[PDB]
Structure 1
Amino acid sequence: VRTIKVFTTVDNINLHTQVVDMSMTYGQQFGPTYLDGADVTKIKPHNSHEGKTFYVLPNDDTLRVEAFEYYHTTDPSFLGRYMSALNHTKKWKYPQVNGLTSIKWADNNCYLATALLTLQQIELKFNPPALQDAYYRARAGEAANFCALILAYCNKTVGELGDVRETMSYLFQHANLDSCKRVLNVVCKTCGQQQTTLKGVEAVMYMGTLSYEQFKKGVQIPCTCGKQATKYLVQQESPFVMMSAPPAQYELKHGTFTCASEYTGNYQCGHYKHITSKETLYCIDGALLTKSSEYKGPITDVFYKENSYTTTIK
């Protein structure tokens, strides 16, 4: 009986020394097993594997607890989906563009590039250690883990077409946004006034208008009565807001917004670009960079810096 020593892990924080029988597969000994993302379940140990870290599914109570504390999910399929995706995302290129980690276009990843660029520019704190750790590695240029985690947390596979808004909405579920608050007032000529308070994700996201200033002045929405009513923002407590709408021609003015998602196409096939306001307006399109003083284009999401707003409407 010849053997080597390897580490197994669910989180790559807590390594568990194992003695492996070189006659048997990794699958026979540990169950499903991954080496740097590669499925080695059906492979036999090699002498070069001495002292290397393998990922395994949480198949015991110690590991289930470690996995839950790192990823904040009990979904048994999660590690398999993370590893499947990582196997592809570790072959992507992560260009530095304008001081930010982007992604070179591959596998319809334009929505992930736009999400990743947005996350580097808004004040957001992840709860799962897995996302905290992977985000700091992405800020440093190696975003492969962060991208694979986003794909796993969103239940998306590499190659699938994606929506920036739908993606930020899953990521915001795993962010600490508990002390974010929004107060709206709706005015109908028929039904009268209605004041609502929103907490967490619903307090930082709005679908129907790109303009934060228009949301403060009032926007037309269908009432339940069938008339148009006016919704306006009474109070906002959050480090940012995301205003979204089906894509339309829109003017972005330097200094009036943090960043935005341009989308060219239809629901079914399209391409995202990212626009950011610095000393001028930069358009980051994967690896490709352009700049201009002004932008007019099909915008679907705009991000605004915020702290505390109270309306002056009485």
Structure 2
Amino acid sequence: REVRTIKVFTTVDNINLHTQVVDMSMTYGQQFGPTYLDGADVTKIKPHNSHEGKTFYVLPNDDTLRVEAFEYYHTTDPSFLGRYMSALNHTKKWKYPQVNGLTSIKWADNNSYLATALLTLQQIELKFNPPALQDAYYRARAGEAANFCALILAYCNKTVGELGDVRETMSYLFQHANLDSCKRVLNVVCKTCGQQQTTLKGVEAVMYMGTLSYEQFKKGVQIPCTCGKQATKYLVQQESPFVMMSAPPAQYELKHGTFTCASEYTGNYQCGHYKHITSKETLYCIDGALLTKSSEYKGPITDVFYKENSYTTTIK
């Protein structure tokens, strides 16, 4: 007749804890709704004695938790925490070797796009805004990247195993980074129509899709004009700590000392594999846990990152 109970804590951010007394004869789901223990779904499980004192994630189901979840993650997508937990149940089992001084990811679960994204982040100046990403990225740099990788999957609405694109993944991460001071001025010149200047800010100031070469972007790239002519677009002014140049995969030569790092994609629109190339004392190719070196590199490159501070054109 005596209900037997244990004390547990619920949370949405793993920092602020909420004391609960749970009935050991009812499932966690009957008492909390969807409930997770370090990523594992315990909604249909009844409390174990070993659960006493442990922390469980729940969905934001009252106003206090709604505020805590938004302040930590900067999202109000109702499915976010469930997707973060579902990914974490996988990423906590991945291995994160140090390769040439950087945290990589041993290949598992079709994660090569995440490995090259993680390697790239550690080579560019970037600060995240959500505390969740600040905290997880700090841990990832130290070598414990499971929470960071699960957050990337959640913020990008990708599940473990799903085909991912590096450019799109970086776009999501940059949306949650402080790029407010970044600025880009472009000029587009048509022999018929004249010239038109455009200013871009934030994420749009550091990403370009169409050519891999920063030098070519400075000299001019050809794009369509609405009048039918081919116009020339070139970079007038750049203020940012890096730039990212992207293009559909094509054979491309990477020259030591002319770029920071790059992503290589081998395959087709439905199926493929990413590798990472970093330019240090030589060219290192990081493929998850694997490492090779070369003095020259040619391959199907999709994204190239360059160092920057301030650039102003000499084109009149």
TM-score (norm 2): 0.98
For residues 44-66 of structure 1, the C-alpha deviation after alignment (integer angstroms, 9 at most, x for no partner) is: 11111111110011110000000
For residues 144-168 of structure 1, the C-alpha deviation after alignment (integer angstroms, 9 at most, x for no partner) is: 1111111110111111111000100
Q: What SS does the corresponding residue of 1:304 show, helix, strand or coil?
A: strand
Number of aligned residue pairs: give it.
314
Q: d(CA) in 2 for partners of 1:10 and 1:191?
A: 55
Q: What SS does the corresponding residue of 1:202 show, helix, strand or coil?
A: helix
Counterpart in the other structure of 1:231:
233
Q: d(CA) in 2 for partners of 1:24 and 1:298?
A: 55
Q: d(CA) in 1 for partners of 2:312 and 2:61?
A: 52
4+ runs deviating over 3 angstroms = none
Counterpart in the other structure of 1:279:
281
1:277, CA displacement in angstroms?
0.7
Q: How does 1:75-90 map to 2 (within 5 A)?
A: 75-90=77-92
Q: d(CA) in 1 for partners of 2:43 and 2:36?
A: 7
For residues 24-55 of structure 1, the C-alpha deviation after alignment (integer angstroms, 9 at most, x for no partner) is: 11111111110010111111111111111100
Q: d(CA) in 2 for partners of 1:168 and 1:305?
A: 16
1:228, CA displacement in angstroms?
1.1
Q: d(CA) in 1 for partners of 2:162 and 2:20?
A: 37
For residues 193-224 of structure 1, the C-alpha deviation after alignment (integer angstroms, 9 at most, x for no partner) is: 01000011111000011111111111111111
Q: d(CA) in 2 for partners of 1:180 and 1:223?
A: 27
Q: d(CA) in 2 for partners of 1:295 and 1:6?
A: 55
1:227, CA displacement in angstroms?
1.5
1:298, CA displacement in angstroms?
1.1
1:279, CA displacement in angstroms?
0.7
Counterpart in the other structure of 1:92:
94
Q: d(CA) in 2 for partners of 1:131 and 1:298?
A: 31
Q: d(CA) in 1 for partners of 2:191 and 2:66?
A: 56
Q: What SS does the corresponding residue of 2:6 show, helix, strand or coil?
A: strand
Q: d(CA) in 1 for partners of 2:69 and 2:95?
A: 28
1:264, CA displacement in angstroms?
1.0
Q: d(CA) in 2 for partners of 1:268 and 1:21?
A: 48
1:254, CA displacement in angstroms?
1.1
1:101, CA displacement in angstroms?
0.9
Q: d(CA) in 2 for partners of 1:171 and 1:112?
A: 12
1:249, CA displacement in angstroms?
1.2
1:269, CA displacement in angstroms?
1.3
Q: d(CA) in 2 for partners of 1:254 and 1:9?
A: 48
Q: d(CA) in 1 for partners of 2:52 and 2:214?
A: 57
Q: d(CA) in 1 for partners of 2:162 and 2:25?
A: 39
1:294, CA displacement in angstroms?
1.0
Stretches of structure 1 that go unaligned for 5 or more consecutive residues are none
Q: What SS does the corresponding residue of 2:90 show, helix, strand or coil?
A: helix
1:296, CA displacement in angstroms?
1.2
Q: d(CA) in 2 for partners of 1:221 and 1:125?
A: 33
1:107, CA displacement in angstroms?
1.6
Q: d(CA) in 2 for partners of 1:300 and 1:223?
A: 25
Match of 1:22 among 21, 24, 43: 24
Q: d(CA) in 2 for partners of 1:239 and 1:260?
A: 16
1:82, CA displacement in angstroms?
0.4
Q: What SS does the corresponding residue of 1:187 show, helix, strand or coil?
A: strand
Stretches of structure 2 that go unaligned for 5 or more consecutive residues are none
TM-score (norm 1): 0.98
1:79, CA displacement in angstroms?
0.3
Q: d(CA) in 2 for partners of 1:226 and 1:241?
A: 30
Q: How does 1:137-286 map to 2 (within 5 A)?
A: 137-286=139-288
Q: What SS does the corresponding residue of 2:216 show, helix, strand or coil?
A: helix
Q: d(CA) in 1 for partners of 2:29 and 2:271?
A: 40
1:186, CA displacement in angstroms?
0.6
1:93, CA displacement in angstroms?
1.3
Counterpart in the other structure of 1:103:
105
Q: d(CA) in 2 for partners of 1:194 and 1:103?
A: 44
